[PDB]
Amino acid sequence: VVKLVKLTFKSPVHFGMKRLSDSNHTIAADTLFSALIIEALQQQLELSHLLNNLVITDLFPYNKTSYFLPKPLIRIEGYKAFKKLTYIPVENYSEYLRGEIDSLEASKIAESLNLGKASLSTKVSLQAVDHNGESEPYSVGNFTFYPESGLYFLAKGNADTIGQLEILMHALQYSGIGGKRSAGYGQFRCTIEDSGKFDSLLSQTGNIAILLSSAMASDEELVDCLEDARYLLKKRTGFVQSKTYADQLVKKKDFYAFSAGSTFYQKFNGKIFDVSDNGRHSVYRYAKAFWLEGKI
Amino acid sequence: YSKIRIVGKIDVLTGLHIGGSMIGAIASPVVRDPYSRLPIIPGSSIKGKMRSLLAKHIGQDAPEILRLFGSSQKGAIQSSRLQISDAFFSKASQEEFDKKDLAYTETKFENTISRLTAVANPRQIERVTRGASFDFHIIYNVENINEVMADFENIKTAIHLLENDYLGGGGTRGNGRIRFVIDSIDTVVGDFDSSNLSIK
Amino acid sequence: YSKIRIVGKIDVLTGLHIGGGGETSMIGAIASPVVRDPYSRLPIIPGSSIKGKMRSLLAKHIGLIPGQKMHNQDAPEILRLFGSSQKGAIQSSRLQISDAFFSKASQEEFDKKDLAYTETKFENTISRLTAVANPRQIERVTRGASFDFHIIYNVENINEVMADFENIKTAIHLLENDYLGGGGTRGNGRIRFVIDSIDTVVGDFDSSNL
Amino acid sequence: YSKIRIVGKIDVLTGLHIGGGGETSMIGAIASPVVRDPYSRLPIIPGSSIKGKMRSLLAKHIGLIPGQKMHNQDAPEILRLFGSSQKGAIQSSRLQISDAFFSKASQEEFDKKDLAYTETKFENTISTAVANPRQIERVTRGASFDFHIIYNVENINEVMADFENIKTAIHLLENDYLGGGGTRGNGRIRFVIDSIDTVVGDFDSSNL
Amino acid sequence: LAKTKTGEMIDLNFARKVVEENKRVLFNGLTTSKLRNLLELINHVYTKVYNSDDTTLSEDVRDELEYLKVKFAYESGREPAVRTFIEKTYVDKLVDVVLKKNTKKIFLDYCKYFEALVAYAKFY
Amino acid sequence: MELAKTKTGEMIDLNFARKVVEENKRVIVLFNGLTTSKLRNLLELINHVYTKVYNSDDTTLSEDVRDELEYLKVKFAYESGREPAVRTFIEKTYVDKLVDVVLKKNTKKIFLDYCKYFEALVAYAKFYR
Amino acid sequence: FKFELSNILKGARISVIYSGGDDLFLIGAWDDVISKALVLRKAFTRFSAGKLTFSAGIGMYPVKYPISKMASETGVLEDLAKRGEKNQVALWNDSKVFGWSQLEEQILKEKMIPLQEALTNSQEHGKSFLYKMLELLRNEDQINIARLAYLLARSSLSEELTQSIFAWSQNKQQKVELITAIEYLVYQIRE
C-alpha cells in the first residue's frame, strides 16, 4: 500500500548536516524513521510494524507543479550542469534515464527547483550572562520552503502499518522533524494519500534500479548488489536523542549508507541497522531500500 | 502522550527589534522570513525569554524550568514540553499595514552621548512597527498528567512576566513591549482535556 | 520576583523635539521632523530618550568619575538602576522605560480647538560674518500635549528598592528641571511628570510606600 | 551638579515682532504674523530667539575673532555658557533659556483693558515713490512674558564669571533689541528678574 | 455659506463667476480702490474674529458686522458701481447670514468669499 | 505623476515638471521673470495643506483640506493678477488645473502626488538657475 | 595563481588564505582587497591575452566577524557573480554585481574619484552631504531625483560634477554605480 505523504512546513526547518550552522533542504529516510520511532515510543505504539512492514523513502522536494526525485547515478554521454543537478521532476525522470536530457535542459531543471530559500539564523545563549559570564553566539541553519513547495515521501507497508504511520505522522506534525525542533523549527502539516503518478512510476520494470532512500545492504546481499553499481556512500552518524539511552548524550555508531539516487543493477532488501553500543535501549538506523526500476 | 496546541497573537505594544550592513542604513535589521521578507519573532527568542523570566520567578537548574524548556544535563535528559514555533507576521496585521501604506518595520534613529567627549554616535535600528500582531504557535507535551496543571501555571506566570517584561531587543530602552492574546487552546494529539487550561 | 509598574503621563511645557528618522522631507516642509509612531502618525517620546536623559542627569548629579568614557563606568547606583554591560559584570537594568505614546486625553483636547499635535517652528541661523539667516523648519510637539509614560522596575534586591526609587525620584526631578529632547538649551524639551501610579503589577512586593 | 533657576518677566518697550514665517492670511491683512503658542493661540517669545540674540550680543561685546565663520568659534566663556559643537571640543551649554510664554497677569490686564495682545502695524516701502503695503503683527507695548533660564553648575569656580556674562548679556539685550525690525524701533525689551534660586544641588543662589 | 438664486451656492468659484459676469471695466465701473476699501472694512472684524478663540461670534463682533452692513449701504449710496457690486455679489445679505449663523466658521467662509472676490477682480 | 493631461495632451508628472521648467528657462530668468521668492511663497501655500494632509491618514481629502485647496486656487489667481511672472508660471505648469483635478479626485494619494509635482517644479527651478 | 599572484599582491595588506588551480580566497583590508582584485583582473587579462576570464566575489565584514561566515557569504557573492554573465564581481551586497571594467572605471574612476576630489576640495562640504545624496539615491520614490537636484543646486559643487551626478541619478545602471561610489568614498573617509 504505497502512500505519498506531503509535508508543508509552517516554520523554517533545520535539517542540519554535521554542523549546526549547516542547513539541508531535505532529510534522509533514517532521520524520518528515527522521528517515527520516537513518536511511537511517545504514543506507546508497537514498533514491530515500523521495523518490519514499513519501507519509507527519503524526503524529496516538491513544487507547485511537479514532484522531485533524486538524480540517478548513471553514465551520461556540459557535464557540470548534470553534476550540479540534484533533483529531477517525475515526468522528466524517464527522459533523464533514457538520456534525452541535455546540459541546457539539465540547467533548466536545476533552476526549476523552487523548493525554498536557505538562510542562517544567528542566535545567542544568555545562560552564562547571569552566572557572571558572557553571551555565547551560535548559528542555526534553516530552510524556509516556498509556500507551494514542501517535502514529500513515499511509504510502502501493510494496511495496519499504514494506519499506524498515519497516526504517527499526525503526532509528528506537532512534534516536528529535523534539528532545533522545540526551539522554533521543524513544525509542519502532513497530508497522506494514494498517489497515482507514483503508483504508476513504481510499477515499472527496468534494467537498472534506483535507490529512493538512504539504504545499505546486508553483508550477504552486498556481494550480489555491489557489482556494476554507481552509488554515493553517504556518512550517516550523530548523537542519540532519547532520555533512557544513557545518562548523557552519546554518539551513534558511525554508519555509511548508499545515498538516494544510487543505481544498482541487482536490488537488495535493506536492513534496519542497530547503531547503539553499550546503551540501555537500541538505536535503529533505517537502511531499508525503496527501489525504483528504470531503463537506461 | 498528549499534545496541547496553543495558537494566539503577540501584539507589539512598542516597536519590537529582535535583530540578528550598508553604510548609512539599518545596522541592526530585524530577523525576517528569508522568502517573504516579513519580520518574524524566532521561537528561540520567545522560549529563551519565557525561560529566563520563569527562572527569575522560581529563583535554570530548577526541575520545573528544565522539564518545561528541555534539559541535556548528565543524568537529566528531558524533552522540552514547550515547543514554541517562530511567530510569523499575521495576515490580518499585514493587511492592516498594507492599508494606509505603512511599512512593516520602522527605522528608529538613536544616538549615544558619550561621557568623555559628549559626542553622539548614531545608530539606525529596525523595529517591528507598533500594532503589528504575530501569529504564535506553541505545542505543550504531556509527559506527566499530574504535572500539567503546575506546568500551565508556570506558563501563565511566564506569559504574565513577558507581558510586563520586554521581548527580544533593547527593551529597557523601550524596544520590545508585547501583549499576548490566547486565541485557542486545543489538544491536537491525545485524549487530554485542555478546557480548564488557560495560558492567561 | 517582583515587577513594579509606574504608569503616568509626561506633560510638555515648552514643546519637545525628539528628532525623527530624517526621512526624505518635502522642500519647504519640516527639515527636522519629530519621531512619530508609524501606526498612528502621532509624536512619541521614545523610552530610550527618557532613559538616556534621566541616566545622564543622575550620573551628573552623583558625579562622573574622572576621565569617564564608557557608560559602564557610572556610579554603582546608576549601573544597578539602568543596567551595565561591562564584561564579567553585566547588571540587568531594573528600569525598563517604554515609549511615551501620545495620550488619548491630550489627543482629544487637540482634536478639539482644531489644534495640530505637532507645530512647525521657524528658526534661522545668523552668520557670524555675512549676517545672513538660514531658514529652518523644526517640528515640535505642542506645549499642551501629554504622553502616557510607562516604566517597570524589577525588584532584584528588596533592601535596595528604596534607594533605587529615591534615585528614580531624583532623576525625575532632574528631568523636570532639565529638558527632554533636542534643542533644550534653546527652549525645546521642558516637561513635568504630573501623574504617577506606582503599583506592584507582579509579585508580593508592596509599593504603597514607593 | 546644581541647576539654578532664573525666573522673571520680560516686558516689551517698543513692540516685539518675532515672525512665524507667514500663514494663511486674507488679502491685505496678517502679512507677517508674530510667532504664537499653538495651544493657547497667544504670542510667545521663543527661547531660541532670546538665546541666539544674547549669544550674538555677548560675542559682539567680547569681540569676534577675525574672519569668524561658525558660532563654535566664539569666546571660550561664551562657548561654555551657550554651548559648543566643535569637533573634539564639545562644551555643554550651561544656559538653557526656555520659551518666554505670555504672562497670565499681563494677559488678564490686556483682557481687562480690551486691548489686543498684538498690534497689526500697517507700514509700507516707498520706492518712483511707490509704496509696498504690509501688516506686521508686533507684540503690543506693555506686554510681559515670563522668562525662565536654567544654569547648570558644570564648574563651581566659573559660576561667578558665567553669571557676570549672563548679566552683561541681559544688559546688552535690554540696550539692544530683540526679534526683528530693531533698526526701525520695534523689538526693544526690558528684563525684570523675580528670583534666582538653586532648585537642584547645594549651590547658593543668594549671592547671584 | 449661503444659497443664491436658482440654487447657486456662495463660493469662491461663485466669486469668479460673478467677476467674469460683471466684466465688460468691472461691475459697471467698479475700481480697485472701492473694493480695497470694502476689504479694509472686512479686515478689522476679520482680525478680531481670528484672534478670538471662541467659536461663537462675540457680541462686539456682531455689532461690528452690523456696522459693516451700514457702511456697505453707505458705500453703495456713494458710488453706483459699489451698489452694483454689492447686489451682484450679495455680500450685504451674506453679512446677515453670518450674523444669523453666529459661528466663526461661517464668518471666515464669508471673509474667504470676499477675498476671492478681490483676488478675481485683480486677476481679471 | 498620473495627475492629468495638458491641453496639448502631454502627460503631467515629475518629468513633465522638469520639461516645463527647462522650456521656460531663459538665459537665468524662468517663467518670464519668476523670482525665487514668489515660487517659495506659492510653495508655502502648498506646504500648509501638505502638512495638514501628511499628518492625516484618511484616504479621502477632509473638508477643511478641500476648502484650503479652493483658497489655494484663490491665492494662485491673486498672485497671477499681482505678478505677471507668477501668472506665466501657473499657466505653463498648469498648477491651478491640477488643483481642481485633485479637488475632483478627493484622494490623499493624488494630493500627495500634486504636492510632489509642485516640489519638483521648485527643485528644478532652483536647479536650472 | 601561485607565483604571479604573489607578485601582484606586493604592498597590499592582504593575506592569501589559499590559491588553487583556479580558486582563490584571500582576506585583507577592504580597500586593498578591492584594488588588488581589480589589479589581478587586469594582470589576468594581460597574461591570458583576453581569452580566459575570472569572476569573483568581494565581501566587507567586521574584523571580529567569524572566518567561516565571511568565507560562506563571499562564496555566495561569487556564486551570484558567476550567475548569468561571467567575468563579474559581486561587491558588498548582492545588488552591486558589476562588471570588472564597470567597477574599476565606471565606478571608481568615473564617479568615486570626482566625488572624493569635490569633497576634499570643498571647505563647506563633508560626509553629511554625501549621506544626504546617498539617502536621496536609495529612497527610490521617483520624486527624490528633484530633491537631489535641489540639494546639488544648493551644494555649490562643480557644475560639471553636478550635471554628471544628476544624469547618473536619472538613469538606472548608473544610479547604482553612483551609490556604490558614494558608499566606497564614505567608507574610505571614515575616521
PDB file of C-alpha atoms in Angstrom, chain B residues 13-15 49 52-53 56-59 96-97 100-103 106-110 112-117 123 127 129-132 157 160-166 170-175 177, chain C residues 1 3 5 19-22 35-41 44 46-49 51-52 55-56 59-60 64 67-71 74 78 82 92-93 95-99 101 150 152 154 156 201-202:
ATOM      1  CA  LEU B  13       2.770  47.356  22.140  1.00  0.00           C
ATOM      2  CA  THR B  14       6.111  49.068  21.455  1.00  0.00           C
ATOM      3  CA  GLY B  15       8.423  48.536  18.496  1.00  0.00           C
ATOM      4  CA  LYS B  49      12.691  34.989  27.291  1.00  0.00           C
ATOM      5  CA  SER B  52      14.620  33.443  31.824  1.00  0.00           C
ATOM      6  CA  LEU B  53      11.547  35.125  33.308  1.00  0.00           C
ATOM      7  CA  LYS B  56      13.748  34.555  37.905  1.00  0.00           C
ATOM      8  CA  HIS B  57      10.259  33.818  39.243  1.00  0.00           C
ATOM      9  CA  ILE B  58      11.278  30.375  40.536  1.00  0.00           C
ATOM     10  CA  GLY B  59      14.614  31.547  41.941  1.00  0.00           C
ATOM     11  CA  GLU B  96      -3.841  46.461   8.203  1.00  0.00           C
ATOM     12  CA  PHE B  97      -0.334  47.697   7.384  1.00  0.00           C
ATOM     13  CA  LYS B 100      -2.664  53.281   4.864  1.00  0.00           C
ATOM     14  CA  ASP B 101       0.545  52.116   3.099  1.00  0.00           C
ATOM     15  CA  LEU B 102       2.644  51.587   6.229  1.00  0.00           C
ATOM     16  CA  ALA B 103       5.982  49.792   6.354  1.00  0.00           C
ATOM     17  CA  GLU B 106      10.324  51.239  11.152  1.00  0.00           C
ATOM     18  CA  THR B 107      13.867  52.597  11.135  1.00  0.00           C
ATOM     19  CA  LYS B 108      14.377  54.201  14.556  1.00  0.00           C
ATOM     20  CA  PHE B 109      17.280  56.625  14.705  1.00  0.00           C
ATOM     21  CA  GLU B 110      19.102  56.681  18.031  1.00  0.00           C
ATOM     22  CA  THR B 112      24.939  57.739  22.031  1.00  0.00           C
ATOM     23  CA  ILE B 113      26.004  60.784  24.038  1.00  0.00           C
ATOM     24  CA  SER B 114      29.374  59.828  25.490  1.00  0.00           C
ATOM     25  CA  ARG B 115      30.591  60.749  28.964  1.00  0.00           C
ATOM     26  CA  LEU B 116      34.058  61.808  27.790  1.00  0.00           C
ATOM     27  CA  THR B 117      33.671  63.853  24.595  1.00  0.00           C
ATOM     28  CA  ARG B 123      22.594  54.008  15.003  1.00  0.00           C
ATOM     29  CA  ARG B 127      11.938  47.661  14.843  1.00  0.00           C
ATOM     30  CA  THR B 129       6.121  48.641  13.909  1.00  0.00           C
ATOM     31  CA  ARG B 130       3.841  49.087  16.908  1.00  0.00           C
ATOM     32  CA  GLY B 131       0.440  47.496  16.408  1.00  0.00           C
ATOM     33  CA  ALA B 132       1.788  44.516  14.476  1.00  0.00           C
ATOM     34  CA  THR B 157       3.429  33.202  35.144  1.00  0.00           C
ATOM     35  CA  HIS B 160       2.406  37.465  32.571  1.00  0.00           C
ATOM     36  CA  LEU B 161       6.063  38.401  33.039  1.00  0.00           C
ATOM     37  CA  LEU B 162       6.587  38.560  29.263  1.00  0.00           C
ATOM     38  CA  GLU B 163       3.578  40.861  29.032  1.00  0.00           C
ATOM     39  CA  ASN B 164       5.306  43.006  31.664  1.00  0.00           C
ATOM     40  CA  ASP B 165       8.919  42.324  30.590  1.00  0.00           C
ATOM     41  CA  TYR B 166      10.028  43.165  27.056  1.00  0.00           C
ATOM     42  CA  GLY B 170      16.771  46.684  23.785  1.00  0.00           C
ATOM     43  CA  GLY B 171      13.590  46.575  25.816  1.00  0.00           C
ATOM     44  CA  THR B 172      14.938  48.509  28.786  1.00  0.00           C
ATOM     45  CA  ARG B 173      15.087  51.411  26.329  1.00  0.00           C
ATOM     46  CA  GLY B 174      11.514  50.663  25.208  1.00  0.00           C
ATOM     47  CA  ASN B 175      12.084  48.345  22.245  1.00  0.00           C
ATOM     48  CA  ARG B 177       6.910  45.640  24.747  1.00  0.00           C
TER      49      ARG B 177
ATOM     50  CA  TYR C   1      10.371  38.016  41.511  1.00  0.00           C
ATOM     51  CA  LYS C   3       7.777  43.898  38.993  1.00  0.00           C
ATOM     52  CA  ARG C   5       4.725  49.406  37.324  1.00  0.00           C
ATOM     53  CA  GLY C  19      14.101  64.215  16.140  1.00  0.00           C
ATOM     54  CA  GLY C  20      12.758  61.550  13.828  1.00  0.00           C
ATOM     55  CA  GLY C  21      14.308  59.245  11.278  1.00  0.00           C
ATOM     56  CA  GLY C  22      15.362  62.092   8.998  1.00  0.00           C
ATOM     57  CA  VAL C  35       9.935  60.851  15.928  1.00  0.00           C
ATOM     58  CA  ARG C  36       6.381  59.624  15.410  1.00  0.00           C
ATOM     59  CA  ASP C  37       4.646  56.319  15.988  1.00  0.00           C
ATOM     60  CA  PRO C  38       4.226  54.997  12.420  1.00  0.00           C
ATOM     61  CA  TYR C  39       0.906  53.261  13.109  1.00  0.00           C
ATOM     62  CA  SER C  40      -0.857  56.387  14.401  1.00  0.00           C
ATOM     63  CA  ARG C  41       1.474  59.080  12.965  1.00  0.00           C
ATOM     64  CA  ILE C  44       6.008  59.951  20.827  1.00  0.00           C
ATOM     65  CA  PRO C  46      10.908  57.056  22.946  1.00  0.00           C
ATOM     66  CA  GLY C  47      11.680  55.099  26.083  1.00  0.00           C
ATOM     67  CA  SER C  48      15.331  55.218  25.062  1.00  0.00           C
ATOM     68  CA  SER C  49      15.157  59.021  25.099  1.00  0.00           C
ATOM     69  CA  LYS C  51      16.065  56.511  29.903  1.00  0.00           C
ATOM     70  CA  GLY C  52      19.220  58.052  28.461  1.00  0.00           C
ATOM     71  CA  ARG C  55      20.502  58.326  33.378  1.00  0.00           C
ATOM     72  CA  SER C  56      22.841  61.092  32.217  1.00  0.00           C
ATOM     73  CA  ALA C  59      25.131  60.374  36.667  1.00  0.00           C
ATOM     74  CA  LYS C  60      25.980  64.084  36.582  1.00  0.00           C
ATOM     75  CA  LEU C  64      31.118  61.356  36.900  1.00  0.00           C
ATOM     76  CA  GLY C  67      38.125  60.610  32.753  1.00  0.00           C
ATOM     77  CA  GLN C  68      34.952  58.560  32.361  1.00  0.00           C
ATOM     78  CA  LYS C  69      34.484  57.237  28.822  1.00  0.00           C
ATOM     79  CA  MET C  70      32.031  54.316  28.832  1.00  0.00           C
ATOM     80  CA  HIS C  71      28.549  54.228  30.325  1.00  0.00           C
ATOM     81  CA  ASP C  74      28.982  55.139  36.061  1.00  0.00           C
ATOM     82  CA  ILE C  78      23.283  54.174  38.249  1.00  0.00           C
ATOM     83  CA  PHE C  82      19.783  51.469  34.396  1.00  0.00           C
ATOM     84  CA  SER C  92      20.398  43.865  34.488  1.00  0.00           C
ATOM     85  CA  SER C  93      18.579  47.167  34.031  1.00  0.00           C
ATOM     86  CA  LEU C  95      14.295  50.238  34.937  1.00  0.00           C
ATOM     87  CA  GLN C  96      12.577  49.382  31.642  1.00  0.00           C
ATOM     88  CA  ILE C  97      11.301  52.670  30.238  1.00  0.00           C
ATOM     89  CA  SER C  98       8.726  52.400  27.461  1.00  0.00           C
ATOM     90  CA  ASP C  99       7.956  54.831  24.661  1.00  0.00           C
ATOM     91  CA  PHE C 101       2.774  57.496  23.391  1.00  0.00           C
ATOM     92  CA  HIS C 150       5.190  53.501  31.378  1.00  0.00           C
ATOM     93  CA  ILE C 152       8.801  48.997  35.047  1.00  0.00           C
ATOM     94  CA  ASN C 154      12.441  44.938  38.706  1.00  0.00           C
ATOM     95  CA  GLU C 156      16.250  42.316  42.343  1.00  0.00           C
ATOM     96  CA  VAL C 201       1.998  44.524  38.831  1.00  0.00           C
ATOM     97  CA  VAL C 202       3.813  41.264  39.647  1.00  0.00           C
TER      98      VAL C 202
END
